[PDB]
Design a binder for this molecule. Structure first.
Ligand SMILES: NC(=O)c1nc(F)cn([C@@H]2O[C@H](COP(=O)(O)OP(=O)(O)OP(=O)(O)O)[C@@H](O)[C@H]2O)c1=O
Ligand SMILES: [Mg+2]
Ligand SMILES: [Zn+2]
Ligand SMILES: [Zn+2]
Lengths: 826, 63, 114, 28
RNA sequence: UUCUCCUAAGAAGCUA
RNA sequence: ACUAGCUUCUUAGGAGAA
């Protein structure tokens, strides 16, 4: 029977399944050792593997572990979709049943550490030695040294074990007095916010053998890698403290007489407690900058609003700024009957037709915004494998090495469309136009200098969009405050623009689909990849269930372009403002203020590029997990065996940025796993033989990585695999493709779903009911979007463009060439 | 057949919302539920069975 | 200059919705700790006199707001009013298991600190 | 507002369903 | 005066 | 009645050519 081993030799390295000296006398004192001449069937490495390589049809190990440790009975697995987290959230509890067990192992590990420290023994703590009860064995690779000076190696152990610490909530007992589940919850003093001593106590109690120094407050970190490490720890150490202790730290400030309440800090769940630097108690004759920061500060708002208890959502509410709850509903889209009769009169919407109207402007009742914001309950605190994360962040920054970024002045901003809202605490007096025409350049520069040394919490107003959809969800938008997005632009609009103006890259934000651009992108993805197959995925609820750690990783990768214009303190305070504004900030539904658990706001200035960083992170992570989860003695190519060995060595045996192997692995991926990433959509051309042997990512690897790291189960309905390259990507940005002849050369054209363009034709969201001229350009744009359907083999699909043409004819762009010159490269 | 009932239900909830039906959440919720249930309908039987209910909700008032 | 106008309006809002903030509760919960630093999530949890619970259904009304007085955040609240998501007053006797499907689902109960 | 009611009525009459017809005769 | 290109304003469509 | 990207239509400005 195959057993999960964390093997590392001079010939094979990796955490994968394998088909398989008088030192024991110096360790019998510690109770964390088995009696060597008793054991359990499954070791802890088996649990970590089955929970990090989770797939269907082969999850028998996880099932036999869950039904053997009193987690859920055998008739709990007959239920369909018992493993998903979005659907069936009760599995969380079924996982938490293992948590305490895991915690015991942790404590036993520390005991063993002290034993190896007292007995003076060196050696690696391999996961396949610790029993699921908590006992260690197999003392064959340990060297005896002077007693009192031998140290063990726990890098690989704790690193591989970190995900299941927050997946099963092994630290759920630290909320109970005397650390026992049979005791009441620790009545933490409401005024306690520091928790630094408690974090250090938990670290010394669970990770005493952790060699790298850990700072509970991340302001004391050394580099971005140190911030990632310490935040990955604080993620686990913040699941034990009262959830009402985090968030912005406020105090009474004295403003020209009457006192105010101003936030002079922020106790993040990942970045420890971060105090403001440019603070002053006696403030008189404040300027417009400080007044705007105080308005956007939730300190003033939540300090004078009625305490709120919203049982509708499990999210931690804060207050209600308005004396009555606002129930905003989504109206149904107006109907354009002219186009509908024009379509039915030309042989459309018939019985059994291949094209059928499926996209509608769905209406939603007064429980739309709240019940959709409640989808954040899928955002669970996730402790990522910190060595794996610290290497994947390097490979990901290598994926972003071609661009160039840095802090820009306020006069060189390229902000567009100043006719949109500016968050909650400012939309009562105007749009972003007023706040961009009022603050002069020195005011915006001073505000950016302020957010470069402080933390400015903001209130991202959650509004309901009015767009078409093929599903019944509400799909709310999160309008961030103007104070947050202004600084985010000044800090990021040099790297974002450079991503939006670079072709042939992995990130295809900014690259147009028109003028043969789709062919450019597809041929770039192909890029002479041997044995090519295409693969695509769409992250289930990426806006909600994205962990805080990977969002911090994304913001750090996006901030790695300031190696000259920003200090370490400046970069950390910018990351803190990011976390306090777009990661765990407090949102506003109607007039009621809640605390977003951990979701990544979809309204951030840098939402698309940060989501692209996160997608590349997940893809590189799937690649490294597939490369490590393969038997080294079975890989035929010796170069790939050496690559996997050096990968394990750079992960769980090294601590510096091995730029040599970082670049080597980046080249290996970009030559064997070529990605096209638009912010959640990813089309990868990968090698057939490599994925079949397991040397690159696949569908199963992405599913497993999303299971243990992203905390969602990627259903097979949102992923796809294209075998032949003649047919392009089955879907990218909901734009199917096909190889069509246009100018004596077979190119690729993006054709949307005919149902979508038909629904855009018939149903109107209060646009055409005002005038008849807007219909003209609206249908011109729809024909531009729907032209490629003509080259489709199905005639019912092709007639959509002809129908749109015949409708534009009666204007009272007509030619079928203004919609074909959109796809000739020029 | 299906497109006709879907489109008339769309315009029906449009005129309902214009009839200040959103001022009564108990009824607006049922209207919205019927709307979103028939917009995903795959059989004409259930589509009509819910369209008649939406129509009865419409004619309940003198509009 | 609309900048001065928006500054005046925003300062007016700042100074107007700051009245109902001080009831000698912040000065108790701020000066009793070191550094005078207090988390925001406990500022309205310990100083807001008025409270409102938004109950989705009676099954969660009986569990939390059972009777004319209920405990929350280590304090007692006497239910002062109830609204049925339409600005229509709902009397306390109207809430019942039998008369459950005759009102709006989210019931906004407004209570005062005892 | 009248245009929407008229187009709704015309679409309902174009539907010409038995149950819808009984409903529209009971309403009128 | 005509054509082409690049910017400023408004409106619209699609994508994430 | 959010962020970013692309693409249209209509008014103006600046350049190159005829
Ligand atoms: N500001 C907006 O108006 C906005 N609108 C969208 F439709 C999408 N985004 C961003 O793109 C991602 C969607 O990714 P996407 O693949 O479409 O999946 P989803 O998160 O929308 O959920 P689902 O797959 O169930 O539909 C979201 O996470 C969000 O960050 C937006 O910012
Ligand atoms: Mg896709
Ligand atoms: Zn650190
Ligand atoms: Zn910088």
């Amino acid at each position: 029977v195959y057993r999960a081993f964390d093997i590392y030799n001079d010939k094979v390295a990796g955490f994968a399944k394998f088909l398989k000296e008088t030192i024991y006398n110096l360790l019998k004192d510690c109770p964390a050792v088995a009696k060597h001449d008793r054991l359990t069937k499954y070791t802890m490495a088996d649990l970590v593997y089955a929970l990090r390589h989770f797939d269907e049809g082969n999850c028998d190990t996880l099932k036999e572990i869950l039904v053997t440790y009193n987690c859920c009975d055998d008739d709990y697995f007959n239920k369909k979709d018992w493993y998903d987290f979005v659907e069936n959230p009760d599995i969380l509890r079924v996982y938490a049943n293992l948590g305490e067990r895991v915690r015991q192992a942790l404590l036993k590990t520390v005991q063993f550490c002290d034993a190896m420290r007292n007995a003076g023994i060196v050696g690696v703590l391999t996961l396949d030695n610790q029993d699921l009860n908590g006992n260690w064995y197999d003392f064959g690779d340990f060297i005896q040294t002077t007693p009192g000076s031998g140290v063990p190696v726990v890098d690989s152990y704790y690193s591989l074990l970190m995900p299941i610490l927050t997946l099963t909530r092994a630290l759920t007992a630290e909320s109970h007095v005397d650390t026992d589940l049979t005791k009441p919850y620790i009545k933490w003093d409401l005024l306690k916010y520091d928790f630094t001593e408690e974090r250090l106590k938990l670290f010394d109690r669970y990770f005493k053998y952790w060699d790298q120094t850990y700072h509970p407050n991340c302001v004391n970190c050394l580099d971005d890698r140190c911030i990632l490490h310490c935040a990955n720890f604080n993620v686990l150490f913040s699941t034990v403290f009262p959830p009402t202790s985090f968030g912005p730290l406020v105090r009474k400030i004295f403003v020209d007489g009457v006192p105010f309440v101003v936030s002079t800090g922020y106790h993040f769940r990942e970045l420890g407690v971060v105090h403001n630097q440019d603070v002053n108690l006696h403030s008189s004759r404040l300027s417009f900058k400080e007044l705007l920061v105080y308005a956007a500060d939730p300190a003033m708002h939540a300090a004078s609003g009625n305490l709120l208890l919203d049982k509708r959502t499990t999210c931690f509410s804060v207050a209600a700024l308005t004396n009555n709850v606002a129930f905003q509903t989504v109206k149904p889209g107006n109907f354009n009957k002219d186009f509908y009769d024009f379509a039915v009169s030309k042989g459309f919407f018939k019985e059994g037709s291949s094209v059928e109207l499926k996209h509608f402007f769905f209406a939603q009742d007064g429980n739309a915004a709240i019940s959709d914001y409640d989808y954040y309950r899928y955002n669970l605190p996730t402790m990522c494998d910190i060595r794996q994360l610290l290497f994947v962040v390097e490979v990901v920054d290598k994926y972003f090495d071609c661009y160039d970024g840095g802090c820009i002045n306020a006069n060189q901003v390229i902000v567009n469309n100043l006719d949109k809202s500016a968050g909650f605490p400012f939309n009562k007096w105007g749009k972003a136009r007023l706040y961009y025409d009022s603050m002069s350049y020195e005011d915006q520069d001073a505000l950016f200098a302020y957010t470069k040394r402080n933390v400015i919490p903001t209130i991202t107003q959650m509004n309901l969009k009015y767009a078409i959809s093929a599903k019944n969800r509400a799909r709310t938008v999160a309008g961030v405050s103007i104070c947050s997005t202004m600084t985010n632009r000044q800090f990021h609009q040099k790297l974002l623009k450079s991503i939006a103006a670079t072709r042939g890259a992995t990130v295809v934000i900014g690259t147009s689909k028109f003028y043969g651009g789709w062919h450019n992108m597809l041929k770039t993805v192909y890029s002479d990849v041997e044995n090519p197959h295409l693969m695509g995925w769409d992250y289930p609820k990426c806006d909600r269930a994205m962990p805080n750690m990977l969002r911090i990783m994304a913001s750090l990768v996006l901030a790695r372009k300031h190696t000259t214009c920003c200090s370490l303190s400046h970069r950390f305070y910018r990351l803190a403002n990011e976390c306090a504004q777009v990661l765990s900030e407090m949102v506003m539904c109607g007039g009621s203020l809640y605390v977003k658990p951990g979701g990544t706001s979809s309204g951030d200035a840098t939402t698309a590029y940060a989501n692209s960083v996160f997608n590349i992170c997940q893809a590189v992570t799937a690649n490294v997990n597939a490369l490590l989860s393969t038997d080294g003695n079975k890989i035929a190519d010796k170069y790939v065996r050496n690559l996997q060995h050096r990968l394990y060595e750079c992960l769980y045996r090294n601590r510096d940025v091995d730029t040599d192997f970082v670049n080597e692995f980046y080249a290996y991926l970009r030559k064997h796993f070529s990605m096209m990433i638009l912010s959640d959509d990813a089309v990868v051309c990968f090698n057939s033989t490599y994925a079949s042997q397991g040397l690159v990512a696949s569908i199963k690897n992405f599913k497993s990585v999303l299971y243990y790291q992203n905390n969602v189960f990627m259903s097979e309905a949102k992923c796809w695999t294209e075998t032949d390259l003649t047919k392009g990507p089955h879907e990218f940005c909901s734009q199917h493709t096909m190889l069509v002849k246009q100018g004596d050369d077979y190119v690729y054209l993006p054709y949307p779903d005919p149902s979508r363009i038909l629904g855009a034709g018939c149903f109107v969201d209060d646009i055409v009911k005002t005038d008849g001229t807007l219909m003209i350009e609206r249908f011109v744009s729809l024909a531009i979007d729907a032209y490629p359907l003509t080259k489709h083999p199905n005639q019912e699909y092709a007639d959509v463009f002809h129908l749109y043409l015949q409708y534009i004819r009666k204007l009272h762009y007509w030619e079928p060439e203004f919609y074909e010159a959109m796809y000739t490269p020029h | 057949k299906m497109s006709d009932v879907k489109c008339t239900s769309v315009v029906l909830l449009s005129v309902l919302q214009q009839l200040r039906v959103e001022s009564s959440s108990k009824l607006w919720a049922q209207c919205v539920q019927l709307h979103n249930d028939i917009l995903l309908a795959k059989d004409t039987t259930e589509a009509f069975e819910k369209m008649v209910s939406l129509l009865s909700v419409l004619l309940s008032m003198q509009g | 200059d609309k900048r001065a106008k928006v500054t005046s309006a925003m300062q007016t809002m700042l100074f107007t919705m700051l009245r109902k903030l001080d009831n000698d509760a912040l000065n108790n919960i701020i000066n009793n700790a070191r550094d005078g630093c207090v988390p925001l999530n406990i500022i309205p949890l310990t100083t807001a006199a008025k409270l409102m619970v938004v109950i989705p259904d009676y099954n969660t009304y009986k569990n939390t707001c059972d009777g004319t007085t209920f405990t929350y955040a280590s304090a007692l609240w006497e239910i002062q009013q109830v609204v049925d998501a339409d600005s229509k007053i709902v009397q306390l006797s109207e809430i019942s298991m039998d008369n459950s499907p005759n009102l709006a689902w989210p019931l906004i109960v407004t209570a005062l600190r005892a | 507002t009248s245009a929407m009611q008229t187009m709704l009525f015309t679409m309902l009459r174009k539907l010409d369903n038995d149950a819808l017809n009984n409903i529209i005769n009971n309403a009128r």
